[PDB]
Symmetry: D2
Subunit: 455 residues, 4 copies
């Protein structure tokens, strides 16, 4: 069927039309998935390894094609798209490694052998975002397959095309190794229908959701008796102490601020800079931001592409307007061409709307402050995903690292840093559970404790 | 200081004393207060946590016989079993002390970056504990919570709260000794549906750790909201006896599993599935051992089986036994009651019997004779998945059953009742979320922080 | 170099395949001095570069699989189907090393006001001395973890089948060049074991010795190595136990594999079979009948099950051991025949006192002892060795009792002693070894821990 | 033999003979090992609960005898009483930690299709423990506690320079064994000449593992004589402590005073040299000498004593000669350089990188200070044959990490001296300073062998 328009966020053209499943169709797919739980649960290690490795092989073989899809559909600059594709290859490969290597444990006992075994949770409901639709899908699908789960997967309608390609890739791997196709199910359509059904359905055993904090919170209220993993967003504070290497902090913060036009859960949300160096930092940072190439994601020279929709870009514009109304000083940008939003920098105080709002936009509030106020400002939000500190001081770096109420603390690089094999996630309203393949596999399985009593 | 709620001796039915019952508004105030102490708990040094935990254990040891007597009087637990529970609780606190010092974080390899993890408290842990092992099951929530730097709001079951009140005084003594504000640990007594519910629902509580009925656990998942959730629920635990089982050993093990604490344990034997070829011999042997059990006063040293926790429960169990007999269940022993004192009761039934899908929390044992190829299916046929057991000397069959039994625990050659306190413990399906055992509970009661140091 | 000093022999035809360099001690010393110059380069090689080199080695091996397999057949006398399996394993070993460079975990230890963490660093120069029998995968098991852990390598391969190691050395050189690493980080040193291998053992610049081969040589190494880390993978007379309740068809098939894979020239090959008296006749008949039909001949033939022993010299010696075994009262049941180095599957029934029960023959010569259960553990543990043991039984209690009481680095239940999953920790106790292999385990042997303490 | 009075035991402060103890012949050592062999099965099969109980009871007895044991350290080892108490407290902790690891140590399961693969740790057999004079109670505990925990029989030679606390510990172990009905033959204290009794433990083919703590010279000879045994060595070094120009000087001085002068410098991780940036060298030296000046040097039984005597007059005389040589080579004496029998006073010299003190482990309160530039420091620090502990004082993130990664040592301490050891951390040296790691959990791994068990499924 051809139900739902898929849009190129740069040109605004309809790229194509895809199926939008009804709630009853979503229920049907879940019923089908349930029938294959036994097949997946019993799939040998060698078979899961082979499937995961073959998925990585196909992605590698179609790397440029997949990167182009990310550029056209997600608006992702082609150089950045290639990086995401490369990461997705790594993710499937690492899950293949862990099928073979994941360790269970033996616990000492007099006259008993006590050991653990991990078994699938059953049906994993994977709900993936528009921004890194390929690698973030890989971060749910790969550990799910690794742990013998059946999958129902709803991708974001804002950039579904790479996920459709991944589903075909998965289907090929499954066919190659004689596994029924019903073990993996891509369900496209409205989030509030298909996504909602995955969350609510009593046959689904676990929800793994990456996306907005608002939606994540709603899931906790509607999911019922299921395991729940949430990877949400935040307003990620990046702190520049008076002793920081300023050139290196600027370069790091340009990346953290403007990669994928700020549409990353760990994008820079606010910069707190010591008053003594604030003028110099601000000048250096604005000057570097000025020279970024803003435009067509398909162009090799493009640094910053469009936001995912005009509707979102319009919303960002109003937020920047509100920020200026509250006394924010515009230092760069604040301009918009349809969905193409230009790098925008303001100096604001800690009470500004931008300090409390995740904009998913290339909009950067800078707060000049004393060291004594920084931790309090950094911790002042309802979120707690990533934070960062730039300093050369051992004592200060450790004090900040301990006291920052965040799932991740980065020293001398921006909040945007994630090494794919590290445990990754947020506290407060920013998440539940940790991702990264090893960690996701642990969430996507249940422990069985086996006790053999000795005569 | 309020005398609101009766506490009952389930053997004599006498009111032992009256304790406070907090209103919802009083529970909210207590949670608000606890919130104030999150920072002090979070920053308590390792040495201080260690010292607090060891001193709790020391105090429990000192009062061991006194605490055991309270379990007998208040929970109806035979004194020999009460002493075992107290000893376990000492171990639980000491193990938490060990882990505060020994729990390991990790380093992830990276070119030109130092990446390592750190565990931090979840914040306020809401601990809701059951009447059946109210001392050690409280220890299994409190000890790891203190170890991981959490503030605690704790609601104990009203059916046997007295030992929890004594433990609270003990914790208070330890906190005073090491100059920690008392507000870091809070015992909130009263109606489960008022105080326990408020702990579950309140937005300031960061994590719920509940042990008790499956029905209540299910409801908690719908009402908790944005919180970490650990649930230790129940089940109808199938115990499987194959053709080749050592029958003497299986009988002895299953007597314990069936009748310890009058079957009021989440991992108590809920059904026995026995091979047809040995069913007659097994059943005769099993009934004959159950016949000689001493039923009576929990304070008596020779007592094997004490009362159920309430008359109300005993009356309900009686009804279920009646219904089981209505459906064709064959009464082999017991089926008699003296107020809350319920006698060991054994029936032969088929897989469709009400007892095969009802958690009775009672000394009532359905036995199904069947064939091997049916056993896994019957075992897996409930909505629950806590513990299962198999008695066999066959390697291939033991592994087949171990893999295929849909349970959080599978016990080979001992009953479902087995739990070593330092093992990961918990259920699948409607029997739980998360694992207990101090090391595992600590992992649930903390969040990971990933720290990345970028090198030149 | 380009010198043609030492004959390399095809053990089937006994023809000289070619001549290779035989390094002098002074040339070995010179090579070790070279390796020393590159310790700093290797120690600082980034993770990505180590990963890339190891994956590229696996890629090239895969691309040359059939060629490498043919070399094993011609040089080691290994039947071609078995040769392919070795090559396949070696690809996996390099790949697994690649993944552990990325995933290996260090730890963080709790401390008030201090961050304490570990860091693994290379031992420095790893001296690898590899055997003739699995020269490719056993070289992979030393080289792959060495590179992963940032060590320089000096490697002496067995002169009895050095050709595949010369090919692996070229593959290593290609990978090093591709990623701009000096070739001096890996050095293949061919020649006499007692000259070149000995220099590696004795040289004070070598930091660790990893040796796989004869127990005699391994013992010598402990006396000659001095102040170095030492890992030894030696042999044994591996006992395989068949209890009266074993699945006989399965035990026979498993034991045919364990007895006759690579003509018994494996450190974990079946050294003796102990069989319960009650089933001894049936077992022996079944085992002899399966052994009878094995195809003995040219390893290049796809049909061949059993190729030649590695030398005429060794085959002559085995023949004398068999003669002595017969002298002692051994009963010849099959074979005993020899054609140059081609030794036919040979089976004797003997008693526990026979020379075969104490002698590692590295040959297709299988002593069978009929006995009772209670004597089995004592017979099995009666040697100076302790590599692998196996037991065939369906009995849980007996399997657990034997597993605990067998004095061996490995205990295999319901498969023969020959079993080794490449990712399991592998090695021996008593005179059979020091340390464990398998990539993750070798990486630990080939690194030193650094504890770093940051005081706050 | 228990009644024999063969060998003098000396108080290093008064030089008085405290008492005379047995010295076993090689043949008596052989017999003790033969007898220990007979109890290998008993120890190997001792239940977890029994091992736990024995370990906890040893800890309980040490705690009940704390003051007495501390006094023995003062009198026999010359250890200031305040430091003796600390050692005793650590030893209680070591036995308790072993108790918890008997219960908590984890084995692993490895994935396999249709196979259950798991590991089991089993004892090495007979552990030959050879312990030093300097921390004779806790360093004995660091070998005994893990050995018992892992089901090994023990033959234990304590240093004859301070054996009395080890005789006391042996009685304590005997009491615990008796209490829990274990034969006394599972643990054997063998006193006498190191070159007789220690040598026999090293060479005897029935001993399965050697764990030795002491001089690097003796450690090296063990590697040449042990043969086919597992070997763990905890040796010494000349431990470099580096003070960068951005260091907190007050903190560095306090930390280095402890590291330099605790137990009169007779610690394997004692400060061996201080490298200090040229730019701050004068200020640091003045502060360091001034704090060292006010240390109380005297009778270890006095509560006020900071520094007691060296373990022997022989050693003190040798140290005197080394200081003389250091001065001959151009070393500038800043403090001390004086001896009263075995009582050696805090001694500080400014020297260059080529001075004898930069290459010599003195086990004495003698501290060479070398002023240099930052870029020379790693090379000077790494220039010895040893590699136990190093330290760096700095507030700079990048520099701390650079030094931490490039210092060729088993331990690197940032902002405390080389003397730091948390008992639960893996502890040991590279180069000539060791093999293996101690710390209960780590020693348990060294003192056991892995068994891999594979259950093949149908």
């Amino acid at each position: 069927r051809e139900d739902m328009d898929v849009i190129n966020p740069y040109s605004l053209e309809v790229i194509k039309k895809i199926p939008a499943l009804s709630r009853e169709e979503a229920k049907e797919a879940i019923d089908t998935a349930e029938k294959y739980k036994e097949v997946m649960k019993n799939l040998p290690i060698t078979k899961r390894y082979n499937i995961l490795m073959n998925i990585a092989k196909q992605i590698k073989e179609k790397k440029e094609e997949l990167a182009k899809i990310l550029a056209i559909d997600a608006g992702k600059p082609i150089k950045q798209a290639r990086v995401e594709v490369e990461r997705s290859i790594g993710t499937f490969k690492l899950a293949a490694f862990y099928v073979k290597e994941h360790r269970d444990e033996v616990i000492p006992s007099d006259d008993r052998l006590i050991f653990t075994r991990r078994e699938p949770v059953g049906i994993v409901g994977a709900i993936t975002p528009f921004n890194f639709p390929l690698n973030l899908s890989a971060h749910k699908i790969a550990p799910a397959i690794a742990t013998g789960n059946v999958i129902v997967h709803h991708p974001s309608s804002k950039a579904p095309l790479v996920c459709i390609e991944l589903a075909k890739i998965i289907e090929n791997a499954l066919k190659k190794y004689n596994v029924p196709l019903g073990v993996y199910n891509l369900l496209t359509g409205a989030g509030e229908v298909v996504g909602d059904e995955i969350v609510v359905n009593e046959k689904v055993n676990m929800i793994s959701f990456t996306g907005s904090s608002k939606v994540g919170e709603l899931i906790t209220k509607k999911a019922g008796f299921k395991k729940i993993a949430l990877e949400l967003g935040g307003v990620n504070p990046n702190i520049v102490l008076k002793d920081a290497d300023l050139n290196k902090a600027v370069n790091a913060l340009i990346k953290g601020s403007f990669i994928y036009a700020g549409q990353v859960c760990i994008s820079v949300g606010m910069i707190l800079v010591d008053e003594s160096i604030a003028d110099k930092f601000i000048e250096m940072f604005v000057n570097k931001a000025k020279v970024l190439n803003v435009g067509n994601p398909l162009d090799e020279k493009t640094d910053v592409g469009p936001l995912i929709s005009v509707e979102h870009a319009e919303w960002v514009e109003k937020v920047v307007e509100k920020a200026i109304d509250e006394g924010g000083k515009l230092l760069l940008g604040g301009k918009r061409d349809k969905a193409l939003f230009y790098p925008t920098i303001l100096e604001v105080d800690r009470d500004n709307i931008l300090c409390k709002t995740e904009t998913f936009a290339p909009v950067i509030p800078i707060i000049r402050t004393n060291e004594e106020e920084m931790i309090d400002i950094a911790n002042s939000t309802e979120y707690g995903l990533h934070s960062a500190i730039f300093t050369n001081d051992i004592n200060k770096s450790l004090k900040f690292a301990e006291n920052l109420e965040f799932g991740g603390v980065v020293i001398n690089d921006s909040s945007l840093f994630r090494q794919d094999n590290m445990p990754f996630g947020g506290v407060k309203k920013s998440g539940l559970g940790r991702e990264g393949v090893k960690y996701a596999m642990e969430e996507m399985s249940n422990i069985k404790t086996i006790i053999i009593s000795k005569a």
